[PDB]
Amino acid sequence: SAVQQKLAALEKSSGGRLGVALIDTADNTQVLYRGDERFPMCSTSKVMAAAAVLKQSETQKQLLNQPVEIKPADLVNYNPIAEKHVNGTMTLAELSAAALQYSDNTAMNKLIAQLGGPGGVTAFARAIGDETFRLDRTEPTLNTAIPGDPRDTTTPRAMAQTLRQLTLGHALGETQRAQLVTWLKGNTTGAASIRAGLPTSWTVGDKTGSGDYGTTNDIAVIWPQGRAPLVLVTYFTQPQQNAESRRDVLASAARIIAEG
Numbered sequence: 596s597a598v599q600q601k602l603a604a605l606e607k608s609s610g611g612r613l614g615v616a617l618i619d620t621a622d623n624t625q626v627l628y629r630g631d632e633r634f635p636m637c638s639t640s641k642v643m644a645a646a647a648v649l650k651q652s653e654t655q656k657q658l659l660n661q662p663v664e665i666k667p668a669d670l671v672n673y674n675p676i677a678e679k680h681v682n683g684t685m686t687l688a689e690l691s692a693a694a695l696q697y698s699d700n701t702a703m704n705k706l707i708a709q710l711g712g713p714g715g716v717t718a719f720a721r722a723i724g725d726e727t728f729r730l731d732r733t734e735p736t737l738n739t740a741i742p743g744d745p746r747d748t749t750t751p752r753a754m755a756q757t758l759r760q761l762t763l764g765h766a767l768g769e770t771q772r773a774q775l776v777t778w779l780k781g782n783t784t785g786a787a788s789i790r791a792g793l794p795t796s797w798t799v800g801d802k803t804g805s806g807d808y809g810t811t812n813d814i815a816v817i818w819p820q821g822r823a824p825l826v827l828v829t830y831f832t833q834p835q836q837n838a839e840s841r842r843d844v845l846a847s848a849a850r851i852i853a854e855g
């Protein structure tokens with residue numbers, strides 16, 4: 596189609612590998628570019644960890660208020676929120692918000708521990724019908740993004756469908772779904788990614804991700820004014836282990852998609 600030629604041209608100009616999946620919920624049509632190729636998820640995996648804990652709270656009603664201790668040994672490479680609470684506690688609600696809105700890696704590792712390890716996060720994906728998602732490691736090594744390594748990857752198509760289920764579908768209870776949407780809408784790291792390619796009046800909730808090999812990701816749910824919402828996943832990775840992030844590529848892909 597027209598959009599796919601423009602995405603192919605964008606990919607060629609960037610020197611990397613681009614994966615795009617759009618779901619238009621108005622008629623359930625999809626637009627895919629390398630939709631079935633695996634990409635390193637990096638921090639976009641945090642949405643699945645937060646959703647898995649939300650699912651647990653449907654039965655354990657007070658789980659989100661449970662205090663979790665933050666020790667100096669818990670800190671990893673990027674902990675903007677957890678560092679403000681060392682030798683104190685954060686609730687599972689606060690850790691989920693930190694993981695999602697600030698991409699806090701200590702918060703992610705606590706969520707993984709709550710679920711019993713990476714296998715517990717992956718299990719939740721399987722339980723909602725995602726047979727592609729796999730989480731294999733904790734932070735920060737899940738971001739190595741080595742070419743061809745299947746660990747900690749998903750495909751654009753699978754992540755788009757799963758993100759739709761979590762935010763617009765009924766994979767979660769009503770209160771949990773609204774909480775997830777609220778968290779995504781308050782993301783602080785996405786201003787230069789998908790958001791930058793879309794009209795300023797559109798409401799976006801997103802989760803970015805970045806890692807080695809210049810890996811630059813963003814997954815988003817989009818509420819256009821007076822129109823059915825869209826789900827957009829943009830994954831991008833590069834051949835050089837030390838390549839710079841290319842958030843502009845994600846913005847350009849979103850702009851190309853929004854022209855339709």
Ligand SMILES: CCN1CCN(C(=O)N[C@@H](C(=O)N[C@H](C(=O)O)[C@@H]2N[C@@H](C(=O)O)C(C)(C)S2)c2ccccc2)C(=O)C1=O
Pocket residue numbers: 637638672673697698699700734735736738739784802803804805806807
């Ligand atoms: C060999 C082990 N290893 C493999 C590579 N690696 C990473 O790729 N860490 C990455 C990391 O920890 N990224 C953080 C994360 O995993 O939420 C934050 N998420 C990014 C995002 O949402 O776009 C951020 C840029 C807001 S930082 C990282 C990416 C770019 C620049 C610095 C750090 C590591 O930190 C690491 O220790």
